[PDB]
Amino acid sequence: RGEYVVAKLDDLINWARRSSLWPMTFGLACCAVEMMHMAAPRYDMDRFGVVFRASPRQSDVMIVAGTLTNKMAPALRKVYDQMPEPRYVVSMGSCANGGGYYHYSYSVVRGCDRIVPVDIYVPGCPPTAEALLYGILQLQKKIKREKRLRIWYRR
Amino acid sequence: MWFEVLPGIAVMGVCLFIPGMATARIHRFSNGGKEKRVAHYPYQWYLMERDRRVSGVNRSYVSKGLENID
Amino acid sequence: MFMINILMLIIPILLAVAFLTLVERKVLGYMQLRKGPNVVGPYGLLQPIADAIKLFIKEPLRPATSSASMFILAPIMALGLALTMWIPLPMPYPLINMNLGVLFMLAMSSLAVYSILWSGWASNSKYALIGALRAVAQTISYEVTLAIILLSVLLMSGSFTLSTLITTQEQMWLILPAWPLAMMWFISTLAETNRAPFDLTEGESELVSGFNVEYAAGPFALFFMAEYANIIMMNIFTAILFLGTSHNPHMPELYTINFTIKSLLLTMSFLWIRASYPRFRYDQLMHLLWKNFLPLTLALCMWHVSLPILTSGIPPQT
Amino acid sequence: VRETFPEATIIKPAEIFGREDRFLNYFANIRWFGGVPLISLGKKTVKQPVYIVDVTKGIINAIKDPDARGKTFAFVGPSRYLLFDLVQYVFAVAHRPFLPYPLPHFAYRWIGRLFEISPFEPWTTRDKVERIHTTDKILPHLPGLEDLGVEATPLELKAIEVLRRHRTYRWLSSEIEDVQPAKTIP
Amino acid sequence: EMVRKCDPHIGLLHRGTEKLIEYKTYLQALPYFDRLDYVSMMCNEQAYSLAVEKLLNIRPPPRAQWIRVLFGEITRLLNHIMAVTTHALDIGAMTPFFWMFEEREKMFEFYERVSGARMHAAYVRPGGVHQDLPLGLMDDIYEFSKNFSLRIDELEEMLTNNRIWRNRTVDIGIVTAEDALNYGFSGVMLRGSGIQWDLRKTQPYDVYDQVEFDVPIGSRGDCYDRYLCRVEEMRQSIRIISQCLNKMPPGEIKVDDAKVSPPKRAEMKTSMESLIHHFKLYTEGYQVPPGATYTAIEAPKGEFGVYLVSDGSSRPYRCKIKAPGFAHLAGLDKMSKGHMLADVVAIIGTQDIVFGEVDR
Amino acid sequence: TYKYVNLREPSMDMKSVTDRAAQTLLWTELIRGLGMTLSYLFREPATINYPFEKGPLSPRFRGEHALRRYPSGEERCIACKLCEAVCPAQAITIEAEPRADGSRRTTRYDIDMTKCIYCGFCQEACPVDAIVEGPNFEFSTETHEELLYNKEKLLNNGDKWEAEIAANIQADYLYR
Amino acid sequence: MELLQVLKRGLQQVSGHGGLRGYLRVLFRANDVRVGTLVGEDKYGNKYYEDNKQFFGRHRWVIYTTEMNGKNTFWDVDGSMVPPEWHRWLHCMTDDPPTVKPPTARKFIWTNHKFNLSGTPQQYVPYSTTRKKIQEWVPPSTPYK
Amino acid sequence: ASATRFIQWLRNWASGRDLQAKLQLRYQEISKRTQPPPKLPVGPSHKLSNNYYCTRDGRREAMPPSIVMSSQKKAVSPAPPIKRWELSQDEPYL
Ligand SMILES: CCCCCCCCCCCCCCCCCC(=O)OC[C@H](COP(=O)(O)OCCN)OC(=O)CCCCCCCCCCCCCCCCC
Ligand code: SF4
Ligand code: SF4
Ligand code: SF4
């Protein structure tokens, strides 16, 4: 039965991908400090298989951790496009979510979702390191629910 | 705790043990239960070639003792 | 049977490399007051499997500006030559018994450098080029001292055959009469494997990812496997050179167990060192080797030519 | 469709070219097989390809245009080309060597089935080969893009946008005016 | 890899903070200062509060002044841990970051217990502080401070005498005392070159004149001396914190003047005057007499000041923020002359730059 | 007062010079650094087992917003708009009118949680403890729209979280 | 010898979880095999434990239920499953568990706690809660003209 | 705190410090997470008499700047020269 085989292969590729999320070493402002605390010993993101890698070529997740300005927007889009696929975007904190404290400024992008597609929004200013971790585990469960091979089988 | 790093070390240790163990056992299997003959110099290869001729079965690891001298 | 012997060499190597990645992450983690992987499989035992699968179903990228053929060739060279470095290793019996096994390992290590130069150059990007030229500097730094350090040790063993080192050290480890050379050998292997505090060709905090910055997915995994394979192999070489294990011909597995423990501990010391020190500047590495090790290595090469002769303890040629 | 929904707007585009098309990208990807097979060497086929943005703007104007209800439009580009001249232009813009050779219809069909075996997205098919070598109909009786206010975009102004990524590093930076256009069937 | 020119292009985190403030009441503008040097949150709040308290011609109560110095010095510990360990992280020593960020995490808890926020407390306000310390907080700060010097001792074991660390930082990025002054440097960027200057000693604020501490001074003006100064400033911060724990006085924690500081919630719900003042302070906000002040503090990164222009209403007319890192980064090209690429990595770290304040 | 951080002349006697030579040749200070990371290997790690274990928080923690009620079930909010006036981010939007019983109550109460800076000014300004920041911090969403809270969402939050919110207010209201 | 006592403690943990099956369940569900004192259990099946000899942060924990509100949570668990009354104790905002210090009862407090519903058909969708502002003129339904 | 005697000795020796006296993990020495209620004091203006606001009004004491010169003897410095700092007696040299 192909349905059974593709279902199990979906679980494997999904499991491999959520178990090995490598965020891009990419942070913008104060939200990036709480992201540092998620890597720090109390939360130890690395224990979930979540490992920062500087090169976009070797990253699976972009965590937009801070305010995105108009001057920075093209560079953020550039390094997101240079991520191979599958790739995911986590929006962290009010600034990245929708502009936040600087929403009405002439120099700020009102939410990073105007520039890139976003999989998870983590609320807070900043979200606590635990809140960000909750967002990463929420991303993992979203990847767990993906049905790439089951949909291909029924195409 | 630190001893939770051991399981990965044990798995890594087992994998590094296999190549040496396998090579030693494969050598005995392919040389009639003995170490593979080592031929670093022409003299040793000459003796091994003579063993192959003397064996009667074209195997330099098949030894012939006094039973073969009349 | 020989084809089976080859497979029972490189498949375990790849498995040991995969689980070394877990061990480094755990060892580094606990030295950093955290745990490292402990979710993906019990105690993180499945973490390497997820990473490998992840990378190989990830999209590989060929950069627009890149030289296509060289870009693909370089990672193949890296892993293929990393595996080649293992075939003459006596554990206690080598897969390929060589007369000049040490000279074979020197040559194969020199050839492997071109997998860094060509990957960096073929990428056609500035951080990759900077990383590649750091490898040129690194090789210039350590290569001369490394060969002459080996020579001094081999003047006590008498040959370039790796199995002879087992005979040489039957009574005593060579680290006793050659601990100064063992110290300089150990640092050179860190520079040879591009390891901290000599991780300059990658130099993450400086070059993002250096020579492999444009590599993704499966091609990236090949460079990673090659590096960790070389870390283990270079520390097996060190164990044979300086901490020789006794070989009982009728119980060869006792050698393997003892020799494996020594190789593991030496590999752990690489992880230990990475956790402890800052990084050299790549000109300071060149001056370390040329202005410190090389003067001392030249003097000790003179001493180890004379010492066998004046003590009447020259090793046998055979 | 015209029976179920009599007031529908039916739009009939020629082959549409754009960044993610299966047209200019399809020809440029023939380069991995060396020469470029063509039925009758592409001298018997004529195409009038239309830019993606033109079709898009035509759809958007049809929504807002009350006159568009119940009509049938034909969206064609400004120029008609011989299939041979079009593919020659594609390889010139991409700076790839162009080695056209003649392949008869039955031979091209046989290879089409070869690629149909793929359970994924076939690189080509028998049906695809047919449509590429079909002449683009001339339909003067139907309204076109100009009837909806869209001014058709020439292929000469947008081919580089689609085909720049098909070049090697040597030719990446070549500018739009470096390649001479294709003969347009007047 | 020789650096022939450094051209910092900033503005990638410019968010028009100074323009936004013109549309806020003085209270509403206070949280913007948490997000400048977003590693020294409560120190930025204190500088803004001192400027407003100066234009208002009011004084915060003694207990609030002691709390401000206590949490100013805890904030200096937060800043120096981030400055030193990321500096080491860039230079390749990744392990101290992890040991010391567990300490940062414990100090984040102190922030959360007084304000309910781990970082952007919005706790220090013109008039005093927002709330009094919860019962039991000072015992836990004391327990933290008892052990912290050992954590500094472990950091120094890894770096201070390490020959690799010294090779990366000794004689790197030398700035002369004269150049440092003309380039507008401040803080450790002056004291590493031997200049004897620290605004807590020379132009003291809330209760810094009542505590005893030593200013560390360098002798070579390079990265290594500036690293030693930051390490010794952490030890002195612990020394100051000890005195604040012992000398904390009783009393109220915001100015007893309900035309500036809001009344207590119980008063607001009983007294007509208190309700009116609560209503007006949270809508129109207190008006500030017209005037202009430049007020500066010894922030962890250097001299942090505000040029605050009041037009007489309840919203500032102009608020110019002087970020110490702005002048420091302008000196990067000067300091990087003759150095290699990896030395520029070290020099960026030795300036201790956060772009929330450089760009605003 | 000041102190010099780096101003010391090494002793030039034979023992000291030979101590420094041993340090240079035998890498003693580098070996000492190895001892420190070794001691950490054998220390219990600081990591907690999230989500089965949680980082500590206090009653003052500022998290997700909620609209509260009196014990009778009546809404506390009487549409004074103090929270909307003080909001540093202009994240609050309010409309009000007389209710069918003449009560002064809101018909709109939106908080744009992507504008909000989670500063707590709104709960300070509220005269009746209607709007609070609760203790929840695990409400990340998959879409932006899910963070634009209207009054129905905020009342549900209050009903959902009131048991914890009331206990937290009880613990801290004497500090306010 | 302590190394022998350590093994007994680790071997005891297998019995403290009711045998190898229960031990392996908690090892694979929570990656932790510690045994604590059962502080209490909520109506959804979550079990709460303390061990005050553990360091602060590790001294309280929850073993989440295997099913909640009709969802299978044997493998899929998340911090939002903790109900509010236990949330305060689990995050150390209070010393007293709700078994000892019960929360005050109100007729409007949710009887059934809901976890994070994002990405499901129960998710929140924003909308304007106000009525139409301008009433438009409606023409008559008869031809008088 | 649960480290065996041998492990305590090992890390004590490697670090060169007695690490058990100043552990970086917190146990029972921390404050209880429930505390008795406070009873905060009031400020100096909480009086029923002799408390007229006009006598304690800081804002209304602010005055416009003093015009020293406008376009409508010994030399001076802005202040006395700064006194030279003293070396610390706690630890003059690090
Ligand atoms: C009978 C008569 C006998 C005659 C023979 C007598 C010979 C013995 C006496 C000679 C001295 C023996 C020791 C020689 C060892 C090599 C010494 C050396 O080169 O190190 C010094 C080197 C100098 O660099 P630096 O300190 O920066 O300053 C130099 C100024 N130009 O500094 C360095 O190299 C620092 C290296 C930095 C990188 C270190 C990272 C790893 C550190 C941990 C390694 C631990 C050692 C492990 C050894 C394991 C071996 C298996
Ligand atoms: S959301 Fe808050 S903490 Fe994050 S970058 Fe913006 S202001 Fe800073
Ligand atoms: S917490 Fe602050 S920003 Fe958020 S709604 Fe309340 S007043 Fe506005
Ligand atoms: S929530 Fe409070 S402050 Fe806001 S309008 Fe309602 S009653 Fe007024």
From Swiss-Prot, chain C:
Source taxon at top rank: Eukaryota
EC number of this enzyme: 7.1.1.2
Pfam families xrefs: NADHdh (PF00146)
Protein name: NADH-ubiquinone oxidoreductase chain 1
Gene this protein is translated from: MT-ND1
Keyword Membrane part of the UniProt annotation: yes
TM helices/strands, residue ranges: 2-22, 70-90, 100-120, 146-166, 172-192, 222-242, 253-273, 294-314
Membrane topology summary: Multi-pass membrane protein
Record keywords: Electron transport, Formylation, Membrane, Mitochondrion, Mitochondrion inner membrane, NAD, Respiratory chain, Translocase, Transmembrane, Transmembrane helix, Transport, Ubiquinone
Subcellular location: Mitochondrion inner membrane
Subunit structure, interactors included: Core subunit of respiratory chain NADH dehydrogenase (Complex I) which is composed of 45 different subunits.
Organism (species): Bos taurus
Enzyme class: translocase
GO MF annotation: an example: NADH dehydrogenase (ubiquinone) activity
Family of the protein in this entry: Belongs to the complex I subunit 1 family.
Chief subcellular location: mitochondrion
GO BP annotations listed: aerobic respiration; mitochondrial respiratory chain complex I assembly
Protein task: Core subunit of the mitochondrial membrane respiratory chain NADH dehydrogenase (Complex I) which catalyzes electron transfer from NADH through the respiratory chain, using ubiquinone as an electron acceptor. Essential for the catalytic activity of complex I. Essential for the assembly of complex I.
Catalyzed reactions per annotation: a ubiquinone + NADH + 5 H(+)(in) = a ubiquinol + NAD(+) + 4 H(+)(out)
A GO CC term assigned to this protein in UniProt: respiratory chain complex I
Residue numbers bearing the N-formylmethionine modification: 1
From Swiss-Prot, chain D:
Cysteine disulfide partners in this protein: none
Domain of life where this protein originates: Eukaryota
Post-translational modification: Acetylated on lysine residues. BLOC1S1 is required for acetylation.
Cellular localisation: Mitochondrion matrix
Role of this protein: Accessory subunit of the mitochondrial membrane respiratory chain NADH dehydrogenase (Complex I), that is believed not to be involved in catalysis. Complex I functions in the transfer of electrons from NADH to the respiratory chain. The immediate electron acceptor for the enzyme is believed to be ubiquinone.
Family to which this protein belongs: Belongs to the complex I NDUFA9 subunit family.
Oligomeric form and interacting partners: Complex I is composed of 45 different subunits. This a component of the hydrophobic protein fraction. Interacts with BLOC1S1. Interacts with SLC2A4. Interacts with CLOCK. Interacts with RAB5IF.
Protein name: NADH dehydrogenase [ubiquinone] 1 alpha subcomplex subunit 9, mitochondrial
Species the sequence originates in: Bos taurus (Bovine)
Residues of the full protein shown: 191 to 376 of 380
Curated annotation (Swiss-Prot), chain E:
GO biological process, one term: cellular response to oxygen levels
Reaction catalysed by this enzyme: a ubiquinone + NADH + 5 H(+)(in) = a ubiquinol + NAD(+) + 4 H(+)(out)
Domain of life: Eukaryota
Presence of keyword Magnesium: no
Main location: mitochondrion
E.C. numbers: 7.1.1.2
Cofactor mode of binding and number, as noted: Binds 1 [4Fe-4S] cluster.
Post-translational modification: Dimethylation at Arg-15 by NDUFAF7 takes place after NDUFS2 assembles into the complex I, leading to stabilize the early intermediate complex.
Cofactors: [4Fe-4S] cluster
Keywords: 4Fe-4S, Acetylation, Electron transport, Iron, Iron-sulfur, Membrane, Metal-binding, Methylation, Mitochondrion, Mitochondrion inner membrane, NAD, Oxidoreductase, Respiratory chain, Transit peptide, Translocase, Transport, Ubiquinone
Record's GO cellular component terms: mitochondrial inner membrane; mitochondrion; respiratory chain complex I
Positions of disulphide bridges: none
Location of the protein in the cell: Mitochondrion inner membrane
Top EC class for this record: translocase
Topology with respect to the bilayer: Peripheral membrane protein
Residues binding [4Fe-4S] cluster: 223, 229, 244
Modification sites for Symmetric dimethylarginine: 15
Subunit description: Core subunit of respiratory chain NADH dehydrogenase (Complex I) which is composed of 45 different subunits. Component of the iron-sulfur (IP) fragment of the enzyme. Interacts with NDUFAF3. Interacts with NDUFAF7. Interacts with CERS2.
Family: Belongs to the complex I 49 kDa subunit family.
The name this protein goes by in its record: NADH dehydrogenase [ubiquinone] iron-sulfur protein 2, mitochondrial
Originating organism: Bos taurus
Name of encoding gene: NDUFS2
Swiss-Prot record, chain H:
UniProt record, GO biological process: ATP synthesis coupled electron transport; mitochondrial electron transport, NADH to ubiquinone
GO cellular component: a single term: mitochondrion
Pfam name, any one: CI-B14_5a
Region called Disordered, residue ranges: 31-51, 73-94
Keywords: Acetylation, Electron transport, Membrane, Mitochondrion, Mitochondrion inner membrane, Respiratory chain, Transport
Residues the record lists as N-acetylalanine modifications: 1
Subcellular location: Mitochondrion inner membrane
Lipid bilayer topology: Peripheral membrane protein
GO molecular function: oxidoreductase activity
PANTHER family, alphabetized: NADH DEHYDROGENASE [UBIQUINONE] 1 ALPHA SUBCOMPLEX SUBUNIT 7, NADH-UBIQUINONE OXIDOREDUCTASE SUBUNIT B
Protein name: NADH dehydrogenase [ubiquinone] 1 alpha subcomplex subunit 7
Organism from which the protein derives: Bos taurus
Lineage of producing organism: Eukaryota, Metazoa, Chordata, Craniata, Vertebrata
